[PDB]
Structure formats: C-alpha cells, structure tokens
Symmetry: D3
Subunit: 261 residues, 6 copies
Amino acid sequence: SNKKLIINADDFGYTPAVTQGIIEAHKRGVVTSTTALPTSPYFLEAMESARISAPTLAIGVHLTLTLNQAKPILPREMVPSLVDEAGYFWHQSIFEEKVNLEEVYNEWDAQIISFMKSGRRPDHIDSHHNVHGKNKKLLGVALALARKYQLPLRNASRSIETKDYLELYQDVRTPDEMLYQFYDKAISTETILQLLDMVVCSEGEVFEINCHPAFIDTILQNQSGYCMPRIREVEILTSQEVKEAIEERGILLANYESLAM
Amino acid sequence: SNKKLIINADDFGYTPAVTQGIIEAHKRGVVTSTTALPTSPYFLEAMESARISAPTLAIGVHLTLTLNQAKPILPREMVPSLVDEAGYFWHQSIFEEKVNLEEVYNEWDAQIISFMKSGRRPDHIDSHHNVHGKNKKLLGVALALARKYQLPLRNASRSIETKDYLELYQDVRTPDEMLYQFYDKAISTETILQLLDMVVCSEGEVFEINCHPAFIDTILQNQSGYCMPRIREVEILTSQEVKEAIEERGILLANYESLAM
Amino acid sequence: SNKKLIINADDFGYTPAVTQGIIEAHKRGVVTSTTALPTSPYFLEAMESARISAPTLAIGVHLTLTLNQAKPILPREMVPSLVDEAGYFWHQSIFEEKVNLEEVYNEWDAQIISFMKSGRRPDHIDSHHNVHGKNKKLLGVALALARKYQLPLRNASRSIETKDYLELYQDVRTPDEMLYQFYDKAISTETILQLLDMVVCSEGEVFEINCHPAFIDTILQNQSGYCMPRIREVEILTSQEVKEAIEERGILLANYESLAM
Amino acid sequence: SNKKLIINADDFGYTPAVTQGIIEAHKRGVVTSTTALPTSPYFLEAMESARISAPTLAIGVHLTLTLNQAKPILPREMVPSLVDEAGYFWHQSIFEEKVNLEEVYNEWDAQIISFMKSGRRPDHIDSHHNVHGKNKKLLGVALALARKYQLPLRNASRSIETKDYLELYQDVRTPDEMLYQFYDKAISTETILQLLDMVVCSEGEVFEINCHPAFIDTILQNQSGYCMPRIREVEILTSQEVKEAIEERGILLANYESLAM
Amino acid sequence: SNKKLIINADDFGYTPAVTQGIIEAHKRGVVTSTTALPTSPYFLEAMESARISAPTLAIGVHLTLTLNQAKPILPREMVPSLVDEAGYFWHQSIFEEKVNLEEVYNEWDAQIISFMKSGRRPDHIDSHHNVHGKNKKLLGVALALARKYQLPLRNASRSIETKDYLELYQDVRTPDEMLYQFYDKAISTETILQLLDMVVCSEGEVFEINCHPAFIDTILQNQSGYCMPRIREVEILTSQEVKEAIEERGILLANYESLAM
Amino acid sequence: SNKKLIINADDFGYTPAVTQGIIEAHKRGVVTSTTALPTSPYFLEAMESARISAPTLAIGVHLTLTLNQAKPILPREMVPSLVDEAGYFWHQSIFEEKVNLEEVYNEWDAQIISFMKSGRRPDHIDSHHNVHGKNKKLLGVALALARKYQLPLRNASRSIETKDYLELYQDVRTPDEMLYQFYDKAISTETILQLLDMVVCSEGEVFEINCHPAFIDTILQNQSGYCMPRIREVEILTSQEVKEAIEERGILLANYESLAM
C-alpha cells in the first residue's frame, strides 16, 4: 500500500512574513498544505497572496482559543468565557479551565464562516496550540463542526495516553498518524529522515507532519515566542536532501483532498 | 447561537453595468453572494469579470421563466409552453397559467448546465421574479433539481400564507428566513437596520436578505422597469453605517457555502 | 428530456503542443472537458496553463498502465508487475497479461494523488488506451478508486459484447453512452454529425464523445503513433459547421460536473 | 497619408461607474484611449482595474484646475491662487483670472507625479474643461510639462480663432485637429458620422474625438451635472453602425502611442 | 566588449500554433524575442497570450508587403500599388517592381499603428521576407518609420554586397550582423554552433539570429510552404546543448531593449 | 517648487525574503521604488513576484562590483580585474585599486542586459556599496551607461567633498540630494523625521532616501552581516507616523519615472 504524507504548515495568515515563508516552503520545498487563521487581521491578504502566487497550495482552517494578542470573531458579550478582561483570548496555559463548550462551538463555527469570506471552503480543520486535542470535550466540539461542515480533521493525539481520541472520529476522516516532532530543538534534517522512516515502517495509509516555516518580520517577533527557528524550517523543508529522502522512500506527497468527506 | 446573514445580489450577468454594480457592492460593501442568469448573453463575460476582479464573490444560479426580452436555453420546439409567439419567455404576469412542469424541469436543468459552462459549479439556486415560489408545483420542480445537483435552494416563502412551502424542502438546505423587504420604496438605510434587528430577534440560524445593486447602462434601462433605485442600493450597501450595524449586532456575513449539501 | 454531451479531449499534459491544441479546441471550439496525465513530466505545466489561459476548461484524471516512454508514479520495486526491464510501462499489446491488480490499484491511486498536487481535484476519471475497459477486473479497480475518491468514471464499453460492464457501475456515475468513433480514418465533419444524430436518437441522458486534438511538436512525434490527424481534429472541433450542428439539434454541451457524486 | 483617429474618453477614475463604463466602451466599442484624474480618490483603483481587465486600453493624465468638489494635490498653502476659501479648485467660469502660472506648473507637475504612483507613465496629457486651451499662458505651462516629461499633448484649439495655438507646440506632438463636438445635446450616432466625415474631408493625418462614456452611480450623480447622457455615449460608441462607419471610411483607430516623443 | 546575441522568432501571431511554439521556444529555450504580424487575424490573441503566459518575451513588429493570402491594413484604393488584382499582397518574387514608396510608407505606418491596438509599443522593427533589405529605397522607408517612432531596426544586409546598407542607419540602432542561416535545410544543432562561433570570431558587439519556431496547426499547413521544420527549430532551440554552447562561449542573451533609442 | 521624495529599497532580488520584505514596505508603506541585483540567482523570481503581486512598484538596476559571495555576469577571463583568485567580486575595501574601467563598463553593461532578461527595462541605475560614487572615474563609467540606455542615475555624492560630482552628470537626470543616513545604528523613526525635515529645509526639488527593508531568511543570514535591522526598517516604513510625517510636510512621494530622459 502506498504511503500518503501531508506536510502542513501551521499559521498561514499569522503575519505577512509567516505567510510568505510558508509560500516559499511550498513552492521551493515539500510543504503541501497549510492551515490559516481567520482570527488574524492578515488572513484575507494571505488568502489573496495564495490565490495569485501559490495556486497549488492546499489550505485548511486553523481554529483557535489561545492566539496571543487576538480577539475572537464573536463579540465578547457572546463568548465571555473565552476572553480575558480586555477581550483577548486566554493564554494556552490557563484557557482549558475557563472556556464554556457551547461558546467554543459558536466561536469556532464563526471562525469557519469567517474563513469562507475568502470565497474558498477550507479543505480541513486543525487548531492553534492543538487545543482540539487538549481534552475529549474540546475534541468533541471540533468533531461536531467537522460533521456539520463535512471536513476532515487533524488527528488530535500526540501521546500514547490520548490514542483513544481517535475512536471518537468515526465518520470524520483523519490521518492515521500525527507526526508532531519537528519543532524547536528537534529542527534538523535528521529529524525529518527519522519521521520519514517512521512513515515507511508503519501500517497507516495517511500521515501528517506539521511544521511552522516562516520568514521573520517584527509582527512575528512581537507575537510569537517561537520565532527564529521558523527560518531554519524553511531551509530544511526546501533542501534537496529532504526532497530526495521522500523520493527514496516512495512516499507520496499529499494534502487533505485525500481525506475528503 | 450565532446569526449567519447571506446578502445576495440578484441578476449577476443581467447587463454589463449590473454586473459591475454588484461587484462594487461586494468589494466595497456587504454583499456576500450573487446569483447569475445563464440565459443572459452577458453571462460568461460576467463570470470572467468575477474570476479576475471579484474572486471572493460567491455565485449561485438565477433560474428564470420570465426574463424580459430573453429566450430559454432549449429550442422553442422542446419547451413550447414556456414562450410567446416569437420564442421569448412569457411575462411574469401571465406565465403561471401557461407553463408545463416537465418543460420547466428540462429548461431549468438546461440553465444549470449552461451555468457550469463557466467552468464553475453554482453554490446554490434561486429564481428571477421568485418564480420557484409562485406555487408549490413550480417549487417542487426547483427542489427536484436541487436534489439532482445537490445544491441548497433559496427559501421561497415571502408571506405567512406560504410558510408551509418550507415543509417541502426536507433534505434541501435553505435559509431559515427570506428577508425580501429591501426593494423600491423601501430602499433606505433604515430598512436595512430593521431587517438586521429582525435577524437578531429571531430563532433562525441562517438568514438571506436579497437585493438588486447595479450601475446603470442603457441595456438595463431597456430591459428592466426596476432601474434607477439599483444605484441607491449600491450606495446603501457600501455605506459605513450599514457595515457598522452588522458589526454592532454581532452578525456573521455568510454565503451559501454555509448550506452546502 | 434534454441531451447532455461531454466532448472530452484525451491526453492533456501529454506534451506542450498537445496541451495547447486542446486549449484551442476548447476556447475556439466545442471541447468542454479534458483528462490529464499526471505520469507526464509536463503535467503541472499543463495545469498551470489551464489555470491562466483556459479557466473554463473542465479537467479529469487520465489513468494509465501503458503510456509509451513513461514510468509509473510508484517506484518499480513497489509495482514490479507494471514495468518492463528498464522500468517503463508495458506496451498496450502485452500489458493485460502481466499486471497484478493490487499493484494497478496502488499505482492508479498514486496517479490520482499526483493529479491533486496541481491543487485541484479531478472532476472525473478515465484511462489512456481505455485500459479500465480492457476487462472487468481492471474496470473493477477503476470503480473501486471512483468510489474511494467519489468521482464519476468514463463509460468503459465500446462494443456490444462489453455492454454488461455498466451493470457494475451502480453508485459510480457515468455517461449513458461512450461515442468513441471519432478517430483516425473516421476523422471528419460527417462522423461528428453522425454521432450527433446518434445522440439525438437515443434514450440516454448523458453522452461522451472523446477526441484527441493537439498541435504537433517533436515531443508528440517522438511519443505517439497517432500524431498528424490530431491537428485535423482541432480543425473540425473548432469549425462553424460543428458548432451549428449541436445547436440545430438542441444538444447541451456539458462536462462531468453533470455527473458529480 | 492614412487617417488616424484617437477616440479618448475623458475622466477615467472619476467614479467607479465612470471607470467601468469607459472600460466597456473600449472593450466593446471604439474608444481607444482614456485620460485619468489623479485628483480623484478612485484613481488608483481605476488603474488597477485597467491593468487586469482592460490591458489594451491606453491611458493619459487628465490635468485639472477646476474639478468640482475637488482639491489640488499640493497643500493649499503652496498653491493659494488655485483655490477658493475652502481649499477647493475654482470653478471654470472664473479660475482664469485667479491662478498664478508658477503654482499651475507646480500643481500640474504634482498631478503627473501623482499619476505615476500607479506605477505607470501616462502616455499623454490633456485637461478637464480644456483649461490648457483657455489662453496661451496656460497652454505654455502645459507645454513646459509636456517637454519635461516628453509626452504628447491634446490639441488645445477648439475654435478657428485659436488655430495659432498650434504654432507654439514645436517639438510637442499633437493631433492635427480637436473634434470636441460629441457632447450633451449633440450626443447621437449622426454626430459621430458627421465627425467621421470631417476626418475624411480635412488635410490632417491625426484627429482626436473626445467623449464622456460612463455607467451611472450615485457618486457621478452627486458630482457632475453631466450624468445620464454618458450612458448614451457608451451605447453609441459600442454600436455596430459606428464601428462600420469607421471601417467604410478607411480610418485607422489609434492612441497617443502614435504621437510618442 | 561583451558579445550580445538576440535570437528572434519571426511570425508571432501568424497562427495560434505558431504563437504557442514561439512561446515554448522562449520559455524553455534560447529565443529572447519575437516579431509579430499585425496583418494576421490572430495577432491580438497572440499579444494577449504573451501578456499572461510569456511576460518576459520581448516583441517587435514584423512589417510585410508579401504575406501569402493576406492583405494590407489600408484599403486597396489607398495602396493600389501594393496588391494584385484581388487585393492581396504581391508575391516576394515580383513586388519590388510594383510598389510605390509612399504607399509602402503609409501601409507600414498603418501596420505599426495596428500593432499598437494591442496596447503595447513594439520594441523594434523588422520585415517578413526581409523586404526592407530588398533595395536601399525600401530600406529608406523602413528607416524613416524607425526614426518617426524611435525604434531600432533589424540589420537588413544578408550579403557582403549590401554591407553599405548599414551606412544609412545613422541614429537608427541595429545589430552589427544579421545571422540568417538558420533555415530549412540548414536546420540543425551544427548550424547553431557554427553561428555561435561566428559570433565569437567577429568584431561586432551585437548579433541577431532569426528563426521560425512553431507548433503545427492546419492553419500553418495551409498558409505556409515552410511548415514541418518549424518544430525541429523548437526542439533545437530548447535543447541543453544549445544553451550550454552559448554559455561556454560567454555570449550574453539579449533583446532589442539593448538597442532602444 | 514642490518637494519630490523617492524612497528606494536597495537589494531587490537578493534573497526571497528580502524581495518580500521590500514588497511589504511598498504595499503597506512609503517605499516607492526598488533597485534589483541581476547578479543574484533569485533576480528573475523577484521580478515575477513584483509583476503579479506589486504592479505599482518601480524598479531600477542595482549595479555591483563588490557583492559578497557573488561573481560577475561575464566570465572571469573577460573581466579578470574585477575578481579575486576564486572568481568572486573583490570586497569593497580594496576593489577601487584593482579594477580596469573598460572591464567595469562591460560588466555593468552585462548587468543591465541581464536585468532586461526579465522583459522589463530598469527605470534607473544605482549601485551596491555606492561604488559609482567611489571616485570620478567609476562615476564616469556609470554615466556613460546612463547615457547609452537613457536612464537616470542615483546622486552619487554622500559628502560635501563630492558635491562637484554632480557637475559631471550633464544630461543624466538625478535627484538633487542623496539622503543615505537611514542605516544600522540610525534605524529609527526619529532619523526618518529628521531626513524629512532636511527635505523641507533644502533648496532642491528631488530627494532620494535609500533603505534596506527585508524579511529574514537563512539566505540573508548567511550572505549579509546587515540582517536583523532590516525588519525594523520594514516596521518603520509601514508606520502611520511616517506616512503622516510626509503628508504634514507636503512632500510628494515619487519614483524615478519623475526623472526619465
């Protein structure tokens, strides 16, 4: 059986330089997909740039409850459990305890509708800080919107302990394995080969490696503690060695169209 | 629960200036969708203009049985009940009595296939002069094509008396409420606020306000008795007051992708 | 009932001049669809040309097991039954006897995923040399991928003897009739009128006429024994007589969006 | 010599509907050129629409000293002679006696630089209300700029009395005759035929007919007393009889590229 | 000095397949420039295809007095010396003795204006069948236009005998040598290498190699006796050996922007 | 006279992130112009990105003799004085004494021709490390090319001591003053305001402020010791205070089209 590998760049539309770093990683490299933040003021610009300069790039919706220095789509009065005193999303460190699931539902539904103001349907759903995999209840809300909009959803488990998350997916399509290891002190070529061998060795059909390529702008510097390594990711994801490795292993580079509902 | 508001401009492709007036109302204003006439000779040009200058605009198919000075897609010999002596569609005032439902089916099916010559699937179906809501039999024909092409269909009721139309939709998705009031002597900002409050006050999830923005050309003047107010609609739909009002009420501006089947 | 006629150009992306000959036949002529070879190194370029210069053109995936001078998508080690000693596809004359159905499945699945690297979903499936209609087992593999990706599939029967192929389609949508006669010594206007009358005379709803328009380049000359007549096809498919004939018969020119699943 | 006829639509960029009516008159008719107002807030949008939807349209700069409800590019403190007490351009009826030629030069220089924020060089110069033809001093300022930027300039004479104006141009290229009669009560096909005859019957080589095609928006309505006839101009300029009239007379349709320096 | 080599494909716009074969030879090969026939009905389509699919291609005007089965831009009554009894250009074999230089001037002026209906200025001038090099009088007409429009002109001498032709150009910029040998029986890689050596071995700075790349359509077949070798030209001009040959010789690939006035 | 201010970003095309940071600074800020390095392998990609995503951006050629880790366009055997033993440009610290002016001319000619492989003419000339201002002989070579190609040239003086440089330009148009202070430790809003005051307070008409906006990629990191401050330049140049500062001073933002010859 062939192996299908989705290499998805998180945080499309986060900032202008993140958007262009992702486009680089796709056009010159092995990124086949991205997921975009409608909660970001740069979202529509990002989607326009993709339309004209990266028309081959597959794009899903990056839901959030914890985006630093941003507000939800819905007015605070409607989603009061989701925000701090000034109306911004709660920090990931403390959000799980505050949020009300019905409000999370409404806000994420709003985020999906907001994406589609781009004139495009997302091809899938995932989340910033993997908050849809923080616990089964949040996951449950993601799966409900997946069914409602008939979109596949990122595999939420990144631990053996949460492997049972996937029994909840059922009709909602998802990669067989979430390879989340390519991050911060693991940013290197070697990690990538390692993950590729993992794909070649397992029983799965569809695999996702996520990543965070970007160019640096002050907006990213202002907004994310994960900043300078993102350029190193571009470098690795556009390297000849990486492209050859996928080649040598017969791996098929795919997108979430392979999981359409 | 959030409120989703589809603001749909009728008559895309009607005439070159109507098409550009709609594009203005979308790009500078709150129009999120339009429905296009394949029976119009300007249709394909309109769809090209949208592709290059309004790529964010959602577009559905505007079926007709009564378009002034136009002919059906199918040759007269095949749809003889639909046309006057010279082969043009019957006037709305007298069409209901003449047309044969099987011919209406074939012609509307033809209109849908004709749309898709644009290379694009419509995202929904509605009708010129709301002829799919003239009576249950015509409605029935619209719902049959909705099921056949798996497209949501505009809510046909604009009266309490026809509220029972919606019990026929079933699997065919539709807005919970048709807000048709924004027209001719009701063209003003106030009407729009009124309709918005109506949305905020009701139990519905998805609402549609239709409208007829346009620029004026001689072609429109020649062809529609509803002419000069269409520019006033552009003005109102692109006003800061209108945009702010939707904002103040937390309303989500959506399109028929929110009702995909 | 109206008649829907899909005129599909085979071999999009085969060579640069084939691609542009097909675009000509669509933009100036009656070709409404094409099917593209992801196994061709020119595939992505072809898909880009369509995006910018033929945005109205509908495009499906042209699966193959026999493309002269090409290799499968999957490495030879994974599909060893599909290739000659140097790793190229077996010649159509001898392939049926060599190939292993599981390998055919994997390779065609790979070809579909490869198409979608264009950023676009195919709207349907067919095959080079009609190899999906060579026998029921190969057909069976095509239908399995049709169901998996939820795509309509070209009618595989071109003989009375294989009419029973269609009983296997079931949920997989397909034209009611495959009109394959427009080829080599039958290339003429007359053949086309003949096929059109056939459509007007039969009970079917959806019909497909396939064809092989192209401009000539050395790459085509090097690679296909069917070369010089392809320009004659462009000429006929862009002729006023052909356009008028479809007109005179009330035939609707359609694409596989009319058969969406 | 051949006869070369430039048909130039004045007021590109005035309002969104004006802009689009001009594009229509070009794409569907005999307008070969337009002149744009950088003094208008819709100017840059107009140049983007031209770039993507009317690439064949030639565009010059429409200089002004009198545009209703508009202000100079330069701050009023720098051009005090050019404006009324509120900062707006003087009306055409009395500006002549007010303006300082040095300020006229600086402001028109500013307008040309302003045009070039579009990233395009104008292909020629003219003026709103023909103010460069109001007297020989204003003409001299216009010529000074035409020489600085090396651009052709519209023939400023519209009377037998100002025929001597042409003797000042020297190296600045211009059409041999200004045909200004197509306006307001003279808007009709007849007038156009009459002017084409005049082209045929005079000694000149290069002729310019100016015009004011537009679609109608409220903005035009509010801003100009010459409004509804502009759609009749579009009609006449896109008409078959006019295109034929030009051909039958062996007149060549040209733009100011024919007069580049 | 460096050596600058212009490789110009003649006959852009002749037929749709010619146009596309030239775009291929540019995008995949060493063609840096083309010259277009405004006298062809496919000319404007050719310039649109270049704009969107070959933005880097430089384009001049291909003037003619002899194009098979074609007519002048001007009506025959205005250029009676230029045409046979049926209104078509005289064949190259006997036009020399027929044409009136004044009519040649007006018609070539017309052709250049015609080019500019594309909304683009040609970057240089040349001629079909090298008729501007047929004798010094025809050359003088060509030079007169080159000076009027301020455009460089192809070196008209193709014999030691007409070397003195160059003494007439004065201010009109031209390549130092016309390398015309790449044609018909001399179509091969060898020839190209030979001409590159000639470039290396002469004293000139700027050299032009002309060529006739094309894809084949029936239109070309019907219109030109030089047909099938044009695809071999595409092959040779897109070949690795030719690109390498140029590099190894330290030759710079240029266009007529290098000769702008 | 008005005051015209050109804000030119140096190093377009250096790296993909530099290119995009410059597009950002233009589209969201006050950069009106850029100068591109044809000596960079990313140059043609940069010009394509500008064509489709920054059509309003003006672009000149950035000539060089000193670019780190880069080589001349011409083979080293043709320009031996311009390179170290390994074929790379001499460092700015000692190139002055090495180079042969004839080789400088040929190489810079080559760079300009190289630019024009983009299919665009540069709108002006400048140089990396201001090497055209290093002494009057290098300036003379630059002027010779400016005259050959008829292009304006950046003001080479950056000291009271080289004010006499301007006396050499003659017909070559240039800004009145080079404002070079916005660099490295002086990167701040203050500096910019200071330079705007200088514009206000001097006698000149036309001023140039140069700058080095960029996003960060590893390529920039590896290639230039001036790296992280470039993002601060983007920030400052897209800031509201800077846009306001320019307006409040009545300064006109211009590009080198204002200085075309």
